[PDB]
């Protein structure tokens, strides 16, 4: 588990994932734009987020 | 009449998608937020573009 997400991101576009507070990701910074592609181990859930909703953990 | 600017950009976006509004930091915004979903609907007061960000990416100003 390397990130957690920091704040409720709900999607508006059908590439994004779900995120609620405290949810531990699986996570790989883009950094061409600063989205996280990502797999939350609460939901099971895949795809991509805007990177200032997740801290790195480690 | 006026509009005061209502929020101020905090983090760098860089749009995915069509409707999404470019952010850099310090960026002067008139924005209205979307309860069902926490995006901001906004006007970017710098660039003069449009389109909508997330609610975390903006503090309010007073």
Request: charged share 30%.
């Amino acid at each position: 588990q390397t990130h957690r997400a920091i704040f409720r991101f709900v999607p508006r576009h059908e590439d994004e994932l779900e995120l609620e507070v405290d949810d531990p990701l699986l996570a790989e910074l883009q950094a061409e734009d600063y989205w996280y592609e990502a797999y939350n181990m609460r939901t099971g859930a895949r795809g991509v987020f805007p990177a200032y909703y997740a801290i790195e953990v480690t």
